[PDB]
């Protein structure tokens, strides 16, 4: 649901997410991590996720992240920078 | 001849209106002749020697009324008379002290590069004597040392050296450059340095300088809770900016072929 | 990649309403979200933790450069 930024979250939120005590969640997060359904990177500084591979069963809403919220908008930015490479070296392109 | 300009020398200028009348008559002297278009006609230059004396007293009047733009014009004009080759020009008691006053004035406007330029301007005066010239050169040694530490010594160095108005300007030009440090609660008292702005441990007079515009100069975080200074810091996010710099330099190395 | 890759993603972003209007469905063909999520192996926004690694990729980029 959250890629980076909000993906990182406090242990207490995971404690609420696992419906378990925050002290218990230090033990509980490890059990949830153990299932390892999705391979990722997890930091226990705040139990923040910021992990790697994940498989969503389906995308939320109308894939709003897939629109200019994340994708497409970044792609528009790249072509302008590609034009900057052309402007930087038009003669070299020949 | 050309009286009133030299006529009021005994009564210098109790009235500021007299200075204005003197300026109008000086303008009439400019109508008669330019300050120094050429070095020819040394007799006209001898008339300009009388003009130098009235300008020198006029500059003292400008300091007495604390004029800045008019004083700047007069000071530049006095420097131009010294600029005039006029080998015939006689030694002037007013000229030696006023050049020293100009050296102090440069500190007042914070022209530090110029202040050394003025120390250079009179090498023979600086030598060891010219006590009027010596007080600003000693002040310059104190200024690089930090005028704050020796400001009390500088203030009492001469009760009167013809710099009485100029020492008041020196009090006006008290340095507050020490402001970029922790103060108020974190340091609480900076009176130890002895600069007038940070002088006094906590009284309202100290508070007026200390809490001016909230805190001294007034920009930046309040000194009481200030993190030592601006504390801007730096990041390695610049690598993306450095990647943009890499595009320009790398493309050029290829561009040369 | 800047334009043609954007154009196919743009077709799906248009499809969020256009697939509703004429497309089979914005929420359809699992790979529409599954493959896009595979493409979003990198997070896509904010912290990212890719070129912002600092001690990791950034330090290596300097050593090799």
Topology:
The structure is cut from a larger assembly and holds chains A (94 residues), B (257 residues) and C (65 residues).
Chain A: H1 11-17, H2 22-35, H3 65-69, H4 73-88, H5 90-93
Helix pairs in contact in A: 1-2
Chain B: H1 16-32, H2 42-64, H3 69-83, H4 93-108, H5 112-121, H6 123-126, H7 131-157, H8 164-172, H9 204-210, H10 238-256
Helix pairs in contact in B: 1-2, 2-3, 4-5, 4-7, 4-8
Chain C: H1 4-21, H2 31-39, H3 57-64
Question: Keywords, please?
Answer:
part of a larger assembly; 3 chains; A: 94 residues; mainly alpha; 5 helices; C: 65 residues; hydrolase/inhibitor; proteolysis
Beta percentage of chain A is under 5%
Largest sheet of chain A: none
Largest sheet: number of strands, sense, barrel closure of chain B = none
Number of strands of chain B: 0
Number of strands of chain A: 0
- What is the N-to-C order of secondary-structure elements of chain B (H for helix, E for strand)? HHHHHHHHHH
* Cα-based radius of gyration of chain B, to the nearest Å: 25 Å
In percent, how helical is the residue content of chain B? 55-70%
Our measurement of the CA-to-CA distance between the termini of chain B, rounded to an integer number of angstroms, reads 80 Å
Label the structural class of chain A: mainly alpha
Q: What string gives the helices and strands of chain A in order?
A: HHHHH
User: What is the multimeric organization of the chains shown?
Assistant: part of a larger assembly
Shape of chain A: elongated
The geometry of chain B reads as: extended
Portion in helices of chain A: 40-55%
Question: What is the end-to-end distance of chain A?
Answer: 46 Å
Structural class of chain B: mainly alpha
- Supply the number of structural domains of chain B: 1
Largest interface: A-C, 32 and 31 residues
Strand content of chain B: under 5%
